[PDB]
Design a protein around this ligand. Sequence first.
Ligand SMILES: Nc1ncnc2c1ncn2[C@@H]1O[C@H](COP(=O)(O)OP(=O)(O)OP(=O)(O)O)[C@@H](O)[C@H]1O
Ligand SMILES: Nc1ncnc2c1ncn2[C@@H]1O[C@H](COP(=O)(O)OP(=O)(O)O)[C@@H](O)[C@H]1O
Ligand SMILES: [Mg+2]
Ligand SMILES: [Mg+2]
Lengths: 422, 422
Amino acid sequence: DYYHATKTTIFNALLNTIDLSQLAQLDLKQAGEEIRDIVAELVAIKNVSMSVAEQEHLVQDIINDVLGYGPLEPLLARDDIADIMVNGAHRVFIEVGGKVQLTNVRFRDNLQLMNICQRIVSQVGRRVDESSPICDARLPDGSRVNVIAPPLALDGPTLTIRKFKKDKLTMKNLVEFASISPEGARVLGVIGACRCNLVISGGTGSGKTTLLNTMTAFIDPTERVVTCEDAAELQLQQPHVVRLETRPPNLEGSGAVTMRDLVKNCLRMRPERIIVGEVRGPEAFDLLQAMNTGHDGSMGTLHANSPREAISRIESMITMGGYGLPSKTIKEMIVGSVDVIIQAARLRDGSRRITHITEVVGLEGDVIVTQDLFVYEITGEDEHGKVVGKHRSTGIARPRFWDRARYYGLERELAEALDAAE
Amino acid sequence: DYYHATKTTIFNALLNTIDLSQLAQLDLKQAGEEIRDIVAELVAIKNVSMSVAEQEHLVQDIINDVLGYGPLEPLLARDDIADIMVNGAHRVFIEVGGKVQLTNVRFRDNLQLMNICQRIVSQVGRRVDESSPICDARLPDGSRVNVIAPPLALDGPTLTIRKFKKDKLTMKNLVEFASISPEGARVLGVIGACRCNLVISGGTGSGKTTLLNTMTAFIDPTERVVTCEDAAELQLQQPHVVRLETRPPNLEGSGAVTMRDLVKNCLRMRPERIIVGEVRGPEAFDLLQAMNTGHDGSMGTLHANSPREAISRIESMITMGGYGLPSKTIKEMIVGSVDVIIQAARLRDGSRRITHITEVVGLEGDVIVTQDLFVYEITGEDEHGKVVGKHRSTGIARPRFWDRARYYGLERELAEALDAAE
Ligand SMILES: Nc1ncnc2c1ncn2[C@@H]1O[C@H](COP(=O)(O)OP(=O)(O)OP(=O)(O)O)[C@@H](O)[C@H]1O
Ligand SMILES: Nc1ncnc2c1ncn2[C@@H]1O[C@H](COP(=O)(O)OP(=O)(O)O)[C@@H](O)[C@H]1O
Ligand SMILES: [Mg+2]
Ligand SMILES: [Mg+2]
């Protein structure tokens, strides 16, 4: 239609109206006003016949293309849409009500899609191109953006925006979802309250962050909890929480304060309990020190499918930090610091369940010896395709952290809960 | 209400009339006098009337806000306040008697809090800002300051001021609280006077630093004492003490002076006693050398929950130094260097107790063997919930360090205190 030709002509004319870095750094309102003025002047020059609403829509589209996120803007604004999927400039899918459906939306060119994706990832200081075709990030809004570049994605740039959900689950919801039996809920409450050094492992999308947010509710209000996280996602209810946020390197690459520096500083900030948002670098090492030297009860999320895998990953993480420790020293440090590893995994049917509560008991040569206080035993599938399982206690009577439970008077609750279900 | 509104109006008028550039480097007394005159003129013009004391207090508060530290200045002045913790401009906490308590000291806005933090850090010739958000400094007063800027501190800049307490506890206080029986006090006096290579290990918040500072009171004044400590907590009263502190590397990663380097240099100062504030890394190794190769009489704290746990920790930290020393060599070094390990722990009721005063009598069967001279035996909680315990002397008539006590002519005090405790 004539609208497309008019938009193309307006874009071509405006291309020389300002530098690429001029509007990107200027005020958004000023840039929008300038774009509106330029669009009106171009329309008047071309004598394009359109209504005032049509002119406003054209101006909005021009602004979105110049500095926005292009034809994604209608989809991003919508609330019913949970996921946006762009498999090339000509394929856009959206998830509504749990159903994925195709949309008439289509980007102008694969180059436009690549430009928009680069804009989105740079929004958080990350860059995607032929030298880094894969880029996964979490936007400030909380949505997660995953981008694959042309050289990997044959059909064009592949973009996945999982929009943020502001709702937060609670231990009541987890027990009602059967993610943890009531006895498991009480034992986890004891673990959180007794200042045990948690490590909330889990798999991609398995619910580690939500589990950690629900577990932190067991922290005594008087304690000073300090939160280090790559993106604001935890919501503690404690009156005395301190929220820190790792600053990614700028476009030039300066000003990079990694989470390791944040933890190293928290060591000198008088925190009662350090809560690392997600251990994804060498900070693990420092965190373990904070776990082992004061700051009892520090938690931390980790990406690993099994507690043994989590321990192996932590050891490899400490090794990768460049510190010249031997493997046995790292294993000894892990044994000393970590108290209990909670494993959250997503079952084959898509449901999420806490599979293991594995207390690290000690070391034997090159193998860390641990005992599973709680284990999820699967038994089959329901007629609707859902998995069926039960949380069973391994019958341990005096877990290593029992002393801590005794120290805080939570001995009775643990004693009754851990043996109520077996 | 009325006072707050009047102060706000007066401050606005002064800011509109006072040029901040002149007060940036002008004399404090002259600037204060000018501010007081301007405030009086504004009050006369603004129909502000109050008591002479109220007007003087308002003028002083305005002057402090303009140039001083602001609303937290009275807290800094107060001795009773041990630690100040301001996370966000609207939440302030103080440590009183070891208890964290919120206060109604609310800053006007996060901008004022950032300005006050910048003023605080300026004293040490350092700057904290968006470019350099993390700052750690030791003010001339001895109070440590840690500041985090907005881009990292999500809920506003954070400021932790750990003031240097002067009223350090003495052995008289410790015996007053029954933390150590008077016989235990005499044994500790003998241990500290006779230059024993002792390690004061303890649990979180147990009182290791206070115990070490009480132990240091027993050293002959003529002895040259060199203290290496990150936080500068110890306060000795001898006339020939040398105080050193480490340096954390700048965010660029250069300038670090680890405790290891400090101790390695202290080896070349002919010190009579090396007193490491807290052993936390490979520096332990060097200390052990300084403990056995001259400088006999060293001391050093360490975070561990039991004498055997402390020894294992020392082995681990020596191992993590990158040296090729096997387990046997390290254990032999520890046995030959250390004499007395003092374990202080906090009990269920929050009361500190010197749980153990043990020796390291030797190495047998490839494991280090200890010998408890003083132990704490608990007899269950009382009807009030307080733990009931007694200090029991094992009755060992000939401790390994006995000869040392004899060399200084204190053997009679040792034999009396150790036996009378039975
Ligand atoms: N037990 C649960 N029951 C139902 N929904 C859950 C459960 N745990 C998590 N969820 C939901 O699953 C989605 C992903 O969970 P969450 O955000 O906690 O992921 P995560 O484990 O932190 O992921 P990542 O590995 O990417 O950091 C969110 O909608 C969360 O609300
Ligand atoms: N034996 C004791 N009795 C009573 N209070 C103590 C004792 N030892 C330490 N404290 C208190 O504990 C507080 C902190 O102790 P601290 O020196 O930090 O021990 P550590 O350095 O081992 O954590 C001090 O303010 C002090 O008042
Ligand atoms: Mg997460
Ligand atoms: Mg200390």
